[PDB]
């Protein structure tokens, strides 16, 4: 499947 | 120092062939001395500060020499020359390899066969390659693999010389000089002897080193081995491009380290770029095609780039190996976030499907976009192809002709083509990729800037002429106009006059007026308003025509608004829903424009205030009308504030503005408690904006005239804003769907940011931030970045009150715990554990690098102590104080106190601690004892 990481703010740790 | 050859090859700055020739000269005289110096060269190349002596060379075995060099390595660290960073060591690696290769190739017609040099070197390198010392193994493996590729070059030279000798032998036989034929056969025999010796040496290195070191525990060594086997298959295909040498790459492209999968793919590329069409290669590819296609999604993006490029080379080779499913898997990657992958997939797609004239190419791109159920817009598809199909993408004349002129085109396809064309125009005018694809920011090349200007003028011309036609044709479709109206925002406006194009400007304004008075979709009106803003630039000669059309449209809209409200708000007439829809469409058209335009000359505050106060007093007012009236009054107030700057504004004007804002704030406060969610949200956002604009900072930058306009929120208003945050921003979790949840989360994140802006700019009491800080770990993946920026700015502002608010947050969590569980709660639970973990993360936000921290942390303890001993036990001194457990949290901060401050905190703790407590060391009293031990 494909996914968009909508939370580009929880990216860090 | 015996570091001669090593030092030369390191920093010699000398052509390796000269040094190799000097060594061969040293050899010709005293072979043993030269070989010993070569050994020591390899040993020193591994960072070994040891030295092999002549006596060793004479009387020692490889194992013993390796053990003694290991013992005498005399290392300062784990580093060795091949793991050192910097250029002065990458050059060392290059020189090392070059030297090995040049040595071999220069000895290839004589010395290589003396049965002395090569056996010695190969034995040493094999030994060092089977050592547990990583420096030795790494170095010796690199050396042996470079040596092997040199041997391969030698064997290829030998094969060529043998073919030529056989040609001469055949020729001389055809002549029949029998003597010369016998001599040619003797030379054939000697050459076969040489071939056999070279094969022996190659087999030796392959069996003793490669088959072991390609599977070395160290991934770097596996990578060395795979790179070099790829080189061998590339340079002597006739000998090394068979399964017996390809199975290794087949197995290793499943390695768990991307460093190695990358080398596998690059070796296979090097075999496919030859375009010599090998059949062994075709069957290997048939066997590992699934694996490669899967590697298009490798966890390392580099590897996926290279896998895509290898599939492109496979297409070039033969378009029969890949199945439809494979190619579609590769196509789907043009919508990937990482650009390198996206452009690799774009090249794949262009070569597979895209190979005037550029007409059906556009139709195929639109069909592809629509077949791709992965992106609703086209920015990223466009950006993926920008490199390989720039011509097709900038052929806007073909696109416009397809849209206008006349199976034909569908409505879906027309919308998709409008979208693709808008994306291409945007990435041509703007010379950067869409967000997430942009590799930082850079200065455009001269060529890039000239192309920017050329494309900008082409666009300006063509679409200054065509956009009225497109608008007219698709005036009734909302998506199409919303997109098309974004085109003028990239024009060079001067061309409207220097190009004698004012007629089309008028046509465009008329089409816009028709779209506005005909539509209600908010996006359509947004595009209309922002485009009108774009065209009304005061530094262009077309300003007055557009200003006239704008003033006429505003005249019409305001007239209709006043006339509609003259009947909508009549105390008698009970408005229907359709009268409300009419009023709402007019209000929407007015608000969209009042945002981006100064309509202060129409004094729309009256109508909007009347609407809002009717909503308040009656409690029945459609949501959309309410929110748009709120927005429009916001814009009126902001625009009046904009016109106050010049001292040419009257005193009564400033008083008018102040009173308007003061009553608008009360109105928004009233709506903040409304039953409708979106109404509360709109009121909250407009309130936060008003409070920031009118904070004391309104007069910061020499804006002293603005002292009377400052507005500070009530305590009631502060608590109401915080309560809205708590009720709307901090909600339950789980452990529509994707779209609804992400929409909601972005809305709520903007709310939280709106309130934290007031906090970090001291528009509200810092203490409120406690209620927010306490929610940092529980809502980390959603709001943690915003909360952390708040903590950082509050610290930089007033670290002391920041620490006080932090301890207030922990105190709120503690009181909440005791409320839900009880004063006899378990300290081993998950709740108390989480609170002390939050306290640990809070403690790590300190540090004595800034001296003030001391006092800060000290306060955090003082207050802390004062809270733990605040409420006593109903039984009395013989039972723990109620909030005593809090001390076990405070200990998480003792790791930040200084030796001097620990004693002062202890004295302040003695102010609250008694002897009877100091002695108590049973279970329930353990938090106090722990907090004491920490100090």
């Amino acid at each position: 499947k494909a996914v968009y990481n909508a939370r580009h703010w929880n990216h860090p740790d | 120092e015996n570091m001669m050859l090593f030092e030369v090859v390191k920093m010699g700055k000398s052509a390796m062939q000269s040094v190799v020739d000097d060594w061969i000269e040293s050899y010709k005289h005293d072979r043993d001395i030269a070989l010993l110096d070569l050994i020591n060269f390899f040993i020193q190349c591994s960072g070994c500060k040891g030295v092999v002596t002549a006596e060793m060379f004479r009387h020692m075995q490889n194992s013993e020499i390796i053990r003694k060099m290991t013992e005498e390595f005399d290392e300062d660290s784990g580093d060795y020359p091949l793991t050192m960073a910097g250029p002065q060591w990458k050059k060392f690696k290059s020189s090392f390899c070059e030297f090995i290769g040049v040595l071999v190739r220069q000895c290839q017609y004589s010395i290589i066969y003396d049965e002395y040099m090569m056996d010695t070197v190969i034995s040493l390198l094999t030994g060092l390659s089977d050592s547990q010392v990583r420096a030795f193994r790494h170095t010796s493996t690199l050396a042996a693999m470079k040596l092997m590729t040199a041997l391969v070059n030698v064997a290829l030279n030998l094969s060529i010389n043998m073919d030529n000798t056989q040609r001469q032998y055949e020729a001389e036989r055809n002549k029949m000089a029998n003597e010369r034929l016998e001599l040619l056969l003797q030379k054939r025999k000697e050459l076969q002897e040489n071939q056999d010796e070279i094969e022996n040496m190659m087999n030796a290195i392959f069996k003793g080193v490669f088959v072991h070191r390609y599977r070395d525990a160290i991934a770097e060594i596996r990578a060395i081995c795979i790179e070099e086997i790829g080189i061998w298959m590339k340079m002597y295909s006739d000998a090394f491009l068979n399964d017996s040498y390809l199975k290794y790459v087949g197995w290793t492209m499943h390695d768990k380290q991307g460093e190695v999968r990358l080398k596998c793919l690059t070796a296979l590329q090097g075999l496919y770029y030859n375009k010599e069409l090998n059949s062994k290669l075709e069957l290997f590819t048939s066997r590992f095609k699934d694996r490669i296609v899967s590697m298009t999604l490798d966890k390392e993006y580099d590897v996926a780039v290279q896998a895509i490029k290898l599939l492109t080379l496979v297409l070039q080779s033969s378009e029969e190996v890949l199945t439809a499913e494979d190619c579609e898997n590769v196509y789907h990657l043009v919508y990937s976030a990482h650009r390198p992958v996206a452009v690799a997939a774009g090249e794949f797609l262009y070569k597979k499907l895209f190979s005037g004239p550029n007409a059906n190419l556009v139709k195929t791109l639109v069909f592809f976009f629509l077949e791709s159920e992965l992106h609703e817009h086209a920015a990223y598809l466009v950006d993926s192809m920008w490199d390989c199909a720039t011509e097709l993408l900038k052929d806007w004349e073909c696109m416009n002709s397809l849209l206008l002129e006349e199976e034909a085109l569908t409505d879906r396809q027309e919308s998709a083509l409008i979208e693709i064309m808008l994306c291409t125009i945007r990435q041509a005018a703007e010379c950067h990729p869409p967000v997430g694809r942009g590799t930082g920011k850079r200065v455009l090349t001269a060529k890039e800037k000239k192309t920017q200007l050329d494309d900008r003028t082409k666009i300006t011309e063509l679409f200054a002429v065509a956009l009225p036609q497109l608008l007219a044709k698709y005036s009734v479709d909302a998506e199409k106009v919303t997109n098309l109206l974004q085109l003028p925002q990239y024009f060079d406006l001067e061309i409207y006059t220097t190009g004698r194009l004012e007629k089309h400007l008028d046509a465009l304004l008329r089409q816009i007026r028709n779209i506005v008075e005909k539509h209600t979709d908010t996006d359509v009106l947004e595009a209309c308003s922002k485009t009108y803003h774009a065209l009304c630039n005061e530094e262009f000669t077309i300003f007055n025509r557009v200003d006239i059309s704008r003033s006429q449209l505003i005249d019409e809209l305001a007239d209709k608004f006043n006339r509609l409200l003259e009947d909508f708000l009549q105390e008698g007439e009970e408005p229907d829903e359709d009268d409300a829809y009419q009023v709402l469409s007019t209000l929407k058209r007015i608000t969209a424009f009042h945002n981006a335009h100064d309509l202060s000359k129409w004094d729309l505050f009256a109508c909007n205030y009347k609407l809002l106060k009717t909503g308040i007093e009656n409690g029945d007012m459609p949501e959309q009308i309410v929110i748009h009236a709120l927005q429009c009054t916001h814009y009126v107030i902001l625009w009046q504030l904009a016109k106050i700057t010049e001292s040419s504004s009257t005193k009564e004007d400033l008083l008018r503005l102040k009173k308007q804002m003061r009553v608008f704030c009360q109105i928004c406060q009233h709506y903040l408690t409304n039953v409708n969610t979106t109404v509360k949200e709109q009121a909250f956002t407009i309130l936060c904006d008003i409070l920031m604009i009118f904070s004391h900072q309104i007069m910061s930058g020499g804006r002293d005239m603005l002292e009377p306009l400052v507005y500070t929120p009530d305590s009631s208003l502060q608590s109401e804003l915080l309560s809205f945050i708590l009720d709307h921003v901090f909600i339950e979790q789980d452990d529509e769907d994707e779209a609804s949840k992400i929409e909601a989360l972005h809305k709520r994140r903007n709310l939280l940011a709106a309130f934290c802006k007031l906090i970090v700019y001291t528009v509200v009491e810092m203490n409120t931030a406690a209620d927010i800080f306490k929610q940092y770990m529980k809502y980390y993946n959603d709001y943690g970045d915003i909360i952390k920026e708040t903590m950082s700015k509050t610290r930089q502002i007033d670290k002391i009150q920041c620490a006080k608010t932090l301890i207030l947050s922990l105190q709120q969590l503690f009181n909440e715990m005791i409320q839900e569980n009880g004063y006899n709660f378990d300290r081993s639970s998950s709740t108390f554990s989480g609170i002390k973990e939050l306290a640990r993360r809070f403690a790590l936000t300190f540090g004595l690098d800034q001296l003030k921290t001391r006092e800060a942390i000290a306060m955090l303890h003082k207050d802390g102590i004062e809270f733990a001993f605040k409420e006593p036990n109903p039984q009395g001194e013989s039972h723990p104080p109620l909030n005593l457990a809090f001390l076990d949290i405070l200990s998480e901060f003792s790791s930040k106190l200084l030796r001097q401050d620990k004693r002062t905190v202890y004295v302040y703790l003695e102010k609250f601690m008694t002897f009877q407590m100091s002695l108590r060391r049973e279970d329930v009293w353990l938090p106090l004892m722990s907090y004491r031990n920490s100090l």
């Binding site: 499947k1 | 197995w251 992106h375 992400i742």
Partner: protein
């Protein structure tokens, strides 16, 4: 002891290589899509901490107004 690096295990055995051939599921992943819709792209642009804390909660399409808000930062 010595700061010298000495590997105890030098090779991966044959069985682990057969295992690597049998299962690469852990070195592949899902397609990390780029913003699928226009709205989500705008939000990626304007949805960070810096932008959020440097922009008004109610967007202002005219710099003449946005400056009224940005004035009050530091």
């Amino acid at each position: 002891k010595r700061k010298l690096i000495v590997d105890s295990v030098k090779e991966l055995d044959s069985k682990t290589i057969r295992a690597q051939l049998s299962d690469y599921s852990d070195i592949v992943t899902t397609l990390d899509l780029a913003p699928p819709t226009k709205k989500l792209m705008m939000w990626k642009e304007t949805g960070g901490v810096e932008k959020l804390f440097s922009l008004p909660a109610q967007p202002l399409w005219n710099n003449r107004l946005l400056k009224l808000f940005t004035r009050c930062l530091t």
